């Protein structure tokens, strides 16, 4: 029978499979009779079946305290196919191989690494798999609520916590999405009567500003008018779409953390749930330097691409193409890091599985942080600075100049990077997660055995399925923490970032689910009280996110400069208006340059006693930026103090 | 037998002592002692069997071999066990009137007193080598305190330990910067040009008050500016940075010590009324400053005793007296409002009492210091018009030094004067009241005084025993970490203080007060969150003290970016010409302290580039120092 969950005699559900074949140079007999006696003490091509009867599960459940299934009691009570796999795995790990020459091994952790065995896994049916396939696997059930209790009871506590965290995620990124939509409509509608994003488009005030080339050569004296196509759509990320949006984002990120702490407490109430500087930091410093190589490649790309060539402005198509190239390079370099972190972690002598995975987290998460967010931090914080008296950039300790931004507090490049990285990867990781299992399963089914007997045993089909590995949910937490960082660190621009995430996760909460019910082999239902080794990382990300949001609003949003302009530079002090009006902002902010243009920085005109040194406007604006940072951060940690 | 801790039979030590409407409580107390059986001095004793029987509920692990109570491998714990037995056993009636313990019994007034008794031994040696003026510097046997006076007193004297041993490092760093500020005093152009009449005495000021104040000169500042040098020349920066690192160090260092002692020992409507009085005292600090002004204004009409030294001392003493009187009033009112609300058990009641009285004392003490440090000498504009505080009364203005001598004088007189006065009461009140009792109740005994009689004549300690000591020491901690930029000797002033206090309290805990029940405690309790909040606020307030009220960042700015060919006619990083080129001119139709444009700049009396540069430096300094400090404590923890 193809749907055989039992033995030949029947009435005995299979709990595990392990496969090996050492019948056939010279050394083969050694592992042959190593594994020949290994199964002997475990007793209470052929697929070695492992089952745990009542008297075995009862006698080996005494070691670990697990609340059996009304109400529950500690270790003993009276009123689960999932826990059998974990019990069998624990039995395999505890029972060792006894010899007479002092070479003792326990479990197959070392056995499968050497190569004695081939594979080991539990198996499920073809029931709870179909009912979970219909409303939870296929993307048609977008709005259907998931049975997280069923997920916990079927695919283990770790997967249940991962999905509940994702279920809780879009449960309250919909409010962030609707706030983003409100800011979206405010920015889009109020593109006319605000003297911003209309001055730039108007050829009389924001069109007569003759800039000067940003780089050394092969750039002409452009005009601000060309900014129109990207300035009219800039206000959506500016104005009220920036200040209250990011303040609400900070309050939200500080509050739902504690809200999900309460959710975790509720879950615990429901379920039981009871030399360093070198090499390691050397490679991180090397990639901190290698972002320079990445941007050098990016320039070497678009310099040629500009000569090669829906209102596709140069700074839109160029930025999109550059972001795609950088994303491809980031994926390749992430593959390189996936190799090197593993190759350096096993070099050190680690502790058991828990500490090994904790160290692997502490290394790979930082590797991915510096791999992904380095470019975003470069563009956001220290990209378009350092222009002085003769217009001399820092030159980066060489003969190569630095790149300069646009008169908007360059954020369109940042939001394009966000959209193409966290949005492009959203497509691409799902593409691999859906298609790689199909293509490899088809390769196995069309290259190993073809034309079966029309009755395929369950173990054979499961063996043909892809393994899940010990780093099962590590990669999902990694990608989701990357999404979390992109949706909380840089959420000042792109108000629709959670919404772009929202539907994303609604697909993922199915797609992953789908790949967890049809593609990968069933995983042992491990028990965990939380996400683990990521929650402190989440707290650190939130603490850094408050500061980085303040720095995004101040140093690279050009919102504080306009607030300052219509509060203190528009009034009769420093100005000629009557009340808080934003008129004349663009002309009365940019500073003049003498070639012997008008660049973006705030500096004195050529002939002030302090020429090309910062003026009163710059110092006022930077004092306002620092005050805004201090006030917002203090208010945010005060708010989280009230919350927790 | 005056030294008799046993009954007539002997070999049975006393473990505790307790001593038409009248008939009601007479009958209630007559049957109360009946179920407890296993002026009269009821000697409650606990044999071994009752100790084992009713010590099982409160799990205590004590042997050598610390495994569990029921093992086969302490005069202190008998009092606690007897107290627990008294509290658990209730009085049974047939009218639905059930009372357990004497917490309600002594409140009504059926009994008079209840206390354990100690020896006249382990108390004599502990008086000599630990509680005597001849043994001040001798090392503490903290075990001899833990097993004799209880976990609470032991934790109090161990937490006070590091204020005597490793507060010495802070004190010696303070001494080092104290001597550094006095040696490099002539060759810094600061506090020398001020004392030089040629360039620092020609700067005529203008009156700070509306009337009865003449146009003075900076020359008179000399006697207070020359000694100001040690407070802010260069020792303030490294001093406060080291203080922040030091506090964010010993917090976790004492966490480690707490873990070590855990290894050693077992240790098993709101907006109104409550916040209304706090906002009322926030307003009443205005009344306090009005009172101090009214005092020294008249005193002005009445060893280089400059007006701003004698005045700052006299007004500080008057404010300290008023603060003590108000603290008595708050001790009354917090108790009178806390019992109004229906509280939980004793632990939660004392937690609420902590949360109320600590805030009351915070606003009582640190409000004046925050007023002087942060928002005292500001708000001068175009015609020299102060904010007037929503009235016809002007505000008070500071001196061209980033007024800090007033702040350090307030610290020295408050945390130093109280350091004397609290010890004075703690030493003399027991003597005077014991003498009153011994010379007014019974005189001329028969030369044999029973132990219980002498103990009864001693003062009671109460349920709020160590609450006041934690309160005063947390006040000292706040004064030595919040405002530790000036007065580098503040730890050293504390140090000997603590070295005396760690005896004085010790002394008063072996001769004056009645023995206290050895309560079970694993930490100071309900104060560690307060200490963490104090440290987090302390980093920020130290940054604001260095920036907004130290006049140090302006001194960095002058010789970094104003003594260079832009903004200055110099050639290096030199402090020359700082005083003249910082204060801004005022036109009456003087030269005040704030940084504003001269009378005739297109933005007249609006702020110049100097103030905006200095405030940008201040904000950058605050941000950088705070970020570095929490990064450092992240590395530490
Ligand atoms: Ca995924
Ligand atoms: Ca004391």
From Swiss-Prot, chain A:
Record keywords, A-Z: Calcium, Cell membrane, Chloride, Chloride channel, Disulfide bond, Glycoprotein, Ion channel, Ion transport, Lipid transport, Membrane, Metal-binding, Transmembrane, Transmembrane helix, Transport, Voltage-gated channel
Effect in UniProt of substituting residue 372 to A: Increased speed of phospholipid scrambling. Requires lower calcium levels for activation of scramblase and ion channel activity. Constitutive scramblase activity at basal cytosolic calcium levels
Residues carrying sugar: 193, 225, 587, 594
Cytoplasmic face of the membrane: 341-361, 432-473, 516-532
One GO BP annotation of this record: plasma membrane phospholipid scrambling
InterPro entries: Anoct_dimer, Anoctamin, Anoctamin_TM
Subcellular location: Cell membrane
Membrane-traversing stretches: 165-185, 240-260, 277-297, 320-340, 362-382, 412-431, 474-494, 495-515, 533-553, 628-644
UniProt-reported outcome of changing residue 372 to K/Q: Constitutive phospholipid scramblase activity at basal cytosolic calcium levels
Record family assignment: Belongs to the anoctamin family.
Name of this chain's protein: Anoctamin-6
Natural source organism: Mus musculus (Mouse)
């Amino acid at each position: 029978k193809p749907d055989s969950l039992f033995f030949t005699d029947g009435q005995r559900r299979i709990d595990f499979i392990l496969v090996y074949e050492d019948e056939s140079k010279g050394t083969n007999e050694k592992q042959k009779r190593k594994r020949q006696a290994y199964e002997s003490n475990l007793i209470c091509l052929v697929f070695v079946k492992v089952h745990a009867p009542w008297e075995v599960l009862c006698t080996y459940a005494e070691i670990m305290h697990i609340k059996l299934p009304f109400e529950k009691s500690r270790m003993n009570d009276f009123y689960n196919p999932a826990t059998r796999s974990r019990i069998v795995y624990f039995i395999l790990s505890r029972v060792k191989y006894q010899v007479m020459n002092n070479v003792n091994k326990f479990g197959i952790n070392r056995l499968v690494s050497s190569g004695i065995y081939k594979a080991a896994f539990p198996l499920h049916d073809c029931s709870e798999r179909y009912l979970l396939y219909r409303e939870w696997a296929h993307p048609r059930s977008i709005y259907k609520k998931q049975p997280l209790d069923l997920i916990r009871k079927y695919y283990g506590e770790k997967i249940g916590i991962y999905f509940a965290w994702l279920g809780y995620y879009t449960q309250m990124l919909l409010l962030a999405a609707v706030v983003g939509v409100a800011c979206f409509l405010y920015g889009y509608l109020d593109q006319d009567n605000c003297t911003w994003s209309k001055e730039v488009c108007d050829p009389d005030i924001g069109g007569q500003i003759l800039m000067c080339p940003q780089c050394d050569r092969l750039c002409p004296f452009w005009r601000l008018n060309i900014t129109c196509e990207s300035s009219k759509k800039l206000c959506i990320f500016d104005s009220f779409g920036t200040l209250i949006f990011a303040v609400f984002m900070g309050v939200w990120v500080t509050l739902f953390l504690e809200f999900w702490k309460r959710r975790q407490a509720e879950l615990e109430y429901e379920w039981d749930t009871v030399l360093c500087a070198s090499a390691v930091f050397f490679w991180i410093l090397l990639i901190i330097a290698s972002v320079i190589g990445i941007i050098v490649y990016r320039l070497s790309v678009f310099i040629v691409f500009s000569t090669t060539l829906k209102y596709l402005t140069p700074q839109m198509a160029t930025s999109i193409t550059a972001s795609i190239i950088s994303f491809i390079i980031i994926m390749i370099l992430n593959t390189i890091y996936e190799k090197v972190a593993i190759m350096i972690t096993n070099f050190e002598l680690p502790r058991t599985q828990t500490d090994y995975e904790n160290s692997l987290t502490m290394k790979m998460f930082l590797f991915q942080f510096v791999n992904y967010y380095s470019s975003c931090f470069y563009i956001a914080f220290f990209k378009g600075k350092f222009v002085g008296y003769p217009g001399d950039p820092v030159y980066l300790l060489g003969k190569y100049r630095s790149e300069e931004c646009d008169p908007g507090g360059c954020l369109l490049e940042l939001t394009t990077q966000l959209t193409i990285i966290m949005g492009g990867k959203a497509i691409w990781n799902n593409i691999q997660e859906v298609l790689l299992p199909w293509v490899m399963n088809l390769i196995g089914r069309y290259k190993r055995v073809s034309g079966s007997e029309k009755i395929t045993p369950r173990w054979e089909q499961d063996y043909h399925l892809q393994p899940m590995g010990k780093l099962g949910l590590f990669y999902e937490y990694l990608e989701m923490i990357i999404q979390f960082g992109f949706v909380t660190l840089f959420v000042a621009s792109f108000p629709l970032a959670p919404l772009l995430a929202l539907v994303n996760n609604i697909l993922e909460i199915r797609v992953d689910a789908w790949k967890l019910t049809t593609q990968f082999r069933r995983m042992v239902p491990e028990k965990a009280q939380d996400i683990g080794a990521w929650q402190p990382i989440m707290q650190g990300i939130a603490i850094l996110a408050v500061v980085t949001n303040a720095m995004i609003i101040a140093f690279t949003s050009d919102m504080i400069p306009r607030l300052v302009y219509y509060w203190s530079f528009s009034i009769p002090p420093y100005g000629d208006h009557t009340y808080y009006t934003m008129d004349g902002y663009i002309n009365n902010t940019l500073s003049v340059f003498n070639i012997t243009c008008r660049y973006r920085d705030f500096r004195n005109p050529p002939g002030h006693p302090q020429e090309y040194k910062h003026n009163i406007y710059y110092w006022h604006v930077i004092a306002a930026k620092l005050a805004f940072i201090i006030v917002m951060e203090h208010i945010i940690y005060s708010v989280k103090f009230f919350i927790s």
